């Protein structure tokens, strides 16, 4: 039961942080923004379980990814900051009334969040990326915008591809 | 706290995962019996938390397995018994009376068990990997000797490397 629960978590969390590792720099924009969908699983274990199985999901990916993919010793951590504020707001509107108006909107909520979080603390953590500019701002801003849409969409997709014999 | 064993357990097995597709076949010895490291972690696991939680990462890894490298759907199963016989014997033998000479004589013991019990289990599941003699069960023994005592060696460096700042 709780075992269930660790078990499904365990998984998720090894596609995640798997999916780590399949990044790709996105065309004119800064290459320090990736870009994965180690952020999808995490999605399927909040709408699966808590938003906080949730985060657990993008917490572990991260630290693996950390260790490993090291000389990065940041990256890691802004994608995590990513994943779970999207993925806390978007649980924080599905969790309300009803279900799929209220997923996908959770969703665009999300990203929009996600976006605006995101921009700011890149307003003192782009500096340490430094350790280890506006206009720089304005190639991470339209790089989250596309994070947010895209895991949505693929998130959408597969959480669809459940029905299958989540009943049929 | 169920959450931190949770949070361990999942990065263990996002470790072993990956190892799953470091595997390489035995000179002289048949080739659907890889041997990789996916099982360390398992170990790490049963020696800091119960064999309950070395189980749950001997399992995942092999599920997580089974779907990818599905081709041989029986391969991940094998590679789950060898793990649990020889990670629970060798846990119910570090369990009793003290330590280290505990542990390391139940590593010894561990790979005894995991090789008789799987030269039994494989004169009923080598079969199966046809569906997917006698003399090819002594290719399976050497083999399973080499990967109780090898996983062992490996095992039991890392466990060391634990004193660290496990206190110093
Ligand atoms: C300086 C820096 C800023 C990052 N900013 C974001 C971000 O704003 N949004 C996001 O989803 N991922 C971000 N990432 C994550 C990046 O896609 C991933 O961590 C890679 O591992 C970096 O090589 C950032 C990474 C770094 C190093
Ligand atoms: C027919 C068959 C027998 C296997 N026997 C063993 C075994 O006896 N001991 C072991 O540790 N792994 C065994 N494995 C696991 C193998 O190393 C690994 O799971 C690969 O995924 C097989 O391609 C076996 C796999 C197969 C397909």
Same mark, same amino acid.
């Given at each position: 039961?709780?075992?269930? =629960?660790?078990?499904?978590? +365990?998984?998720? &969390?090894?596609?995640?942080?798997?999916?780590? @590792?399949?990044?790709?720099?996105?065309?004119?924009?800064?290459?320090?923004?990736?870009?994965?969908? %180690?952020?999808?699983?995490?999605?399927?274990?909040?709408?699966?379980?808590?938003?906080?199985? *949730?985060?657990?999901?993008?917490?572990?990916?991260?630290?693996?990814?950390?260790? @490993?993919?090291?000389?990065?010793?940041?990256?890691? @951590?802004?994608?995590?900051?990513? *994943?779970? &504020?999207?993925?806390?707001?978007?649980?924080?509107i599905?969790?309300?009334? =009803? %279900?799929?108006? +209220?997923?996908?909107?959770?969703?665009?909520?999300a990203?929009?969040?996600?976006?605006?979080?995101? &921009?700011?603390?890149?307003? @003192?953590?782009?500096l340490?990326?430094?350790?280890?500019?506006?206009?720089?701002v &304005?190639?991470?801003?339209?790089?989250?915008?596309?994070?947010?849409?895209?895991?949505?969409?693929?998130?959408?997709?597969?959480? =669809?591809?459940?029905?299958?014999?989540?009943? =049929?």
């Amino acid at each position: 039961q709780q075992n269930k =629960r660790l078990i499904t978590i +365990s998984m998720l &969390s090894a596609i995640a942080f798997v999916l780590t @590792f399949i990044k790709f720099p996105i065309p004119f924009l800064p290459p320090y923004l990736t870009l994965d969908f %180690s952020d999808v699983p995490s999605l399927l274990a909040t709408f699966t379980f808590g938003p906080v199985a *949730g985060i657990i999901v993008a917490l572990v990916k991260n630290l693996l990814n950390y260790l @490993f993919s090291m000389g990065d010793p940041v990256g890691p @951590f802004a994608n995590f900051l990513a *994943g779970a &504020s999207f993925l806390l707001t978007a649980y924080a509107i599905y969790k309300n009334k =009803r %279900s799929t108006k +209220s997923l996908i909107t959770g969703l665009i909520i999300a990203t929009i969040v996600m976006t605006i979080v995101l &921009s700011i603390l890149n307003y @003192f953590v782009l500096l340490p990326l430094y350790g280890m500019k506006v206009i720089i701002v &304005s190639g991470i801003i339209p790089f989250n915008i596309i994070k947010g849409i895209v895991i949505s969409i693929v998130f959408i997709l597969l959480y =669809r591809r459940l029905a299958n014999f989540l009943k =049929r």
